[PDB]
Amino acid sequence: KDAWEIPRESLRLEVKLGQGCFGEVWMGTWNGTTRVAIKTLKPGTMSPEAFLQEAQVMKKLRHEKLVQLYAVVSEEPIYIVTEYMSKGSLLDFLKGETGKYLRLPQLVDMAAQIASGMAYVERMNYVHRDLRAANILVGENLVCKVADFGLARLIEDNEYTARQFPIKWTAPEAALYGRFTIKSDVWSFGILLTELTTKGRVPYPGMVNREVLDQVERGYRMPCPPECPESLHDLMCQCWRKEPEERPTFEYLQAFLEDYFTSTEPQYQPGENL
Ligand SMILES: COc1cc(-c2nn(CCN3CCC(N(C)C)CC3)c3ncnc(N)c23)ccc1NC(=O)OC(C)(C)C
């Protein structure tokens, strides 16, 4: 069951979906039979051994709301092979043609699905380290899956990529002191909730990374997004407690969001955008 390293010749890279900071994502075909996504890593951006050791852990994480790792090509340039998610990143989906039609019920259901995957990560005593809408994938029927879990711990710049960090999504104890835990992921999830309720806008509008760190450190928190109910902003603010142990669990977040329109905001009615 550990024989998941594959020869590069077993993959056809057929359609380039986009370019990231560290490589490319392709739609392709594996073993002549299977539709896959292929994520490529420029040489020198990740230690092959360290990747394989982490991949052994990641291959064990199996949940309907986590993207499934199928295979790796372990020679530089490293290729990661996963299931194909037909609507791409949640961030692109929110910002695309469909995004303008999403209302609060769809966005809260998407949040509940992300919370369910993260509750699994929580049960497995694992840590994502880079939770944000860019690292959620969307399929048919608004299925959302958590992607890119664990990788941030291993990613480095090469000479090229160095000429180009998600501070705005990162809990202060993680950004400042390297204290990455499930509770720093909960902070990230709170920021992700702002991405959902603004249909993809960058957090802390008008602020650069240094201003965000300065302001958050002195107690600043984002205010309630336009048309967002106060009750959902209150949940965001629980995720952004200074004391990490006082932030909610993903188990709690999942339950709150699943039950939201019955228990919390039954008075919901559609407005201009939500
Ligand atoms: C094949 O490996 C992955 C693929 C994807 C993925 N990313 N994307 C979106 C590509 N998108 C990035 C945004 C860009 N815009 C900014 C212009 C346009 C292109 C996918 N789309 C459909 N299926 C996928 N599977 C992926 C996301 C993550 C991974 N890898 C991964 O999660 O690795 C582990 C499972 C090991 C954590």
Residue numbers in the entry: 260 to 423, 427 to 536
Give verbatim lines from the article:
The novel SRC inhibitor eCF506 displays subnanomolar activity against SRC, a potency that is on par with the current best-in-class SRC/ABL inhibitor dasatinib. The majority of SRC kinase inhibitors bind to the catalytic domain of SRC in its active conformation. To characterize the binding mode of eCF506, we co-crystalized human SRC (kinase domain) bound to eCF506 and determined the structure to 1.5 Å (for crystallographic and refinement statistics see Supplementary Table S1). Remarkably, the structure revealed that, contrary to our previous prediction, eCF506 binds to the native inactive conformation of the SRC kinase. In this conformation, the C-helix is moved out and the K298-E313 salt bridge (a hallmark of active kinases) is not formed, thereby switching kinase activity off. Remarkably, co-crystal structure analysis reveals that eCF506 induces and stabilizes the native inactive conformation of the SRC kinase domain, where the C-helix is displaced away from the active site and breaks the salt bridge between E313 in the C-helix and the catalytic K298 (39, 52). Hence the mode of binding of eCF506 is optimal for inhibiting SRC but not ABL, providing a sound explanation for this unique selectivity feature. Structurally speaking, the mode of binding of eCF506 to SRC (DFG-in, C-helix-out) is analogous to that of the dual HER2/EGFR inhibitor lapatinib on its targets. Biophysical characterization of the hydrodynamic radius of full length SRC (human SRC 84–536) in the absence (Apo) and presence of dasatinib or eCF506 show that, whereas dasatinib induces opening of the SRC structure, eCF506 maintains SRC in a more compact conformation, similar to the Apo form. We show that the inactive conformation of the SRC kinase domain induced by eCF506 is relayed to the full-length protein, keeping the protein in a compact conformation, likely as seen in the autoinhibited SRC structure. When SRC is forced into a closed conformation by eCF506, its SH2 domain is not available to bind to the FAK-pY397 docking site and form the active complex with FAK.
The SRC kinase, product of the first cellular proto-oncogene identified (1–6), emerged as a potential therapeutic target in the early 1980s. Predominantly inactive in noncancerous cells, SRC is aberrantly activated in many cancer types, including breast, colon, prostate, pancreatic, and ovarian cancers.
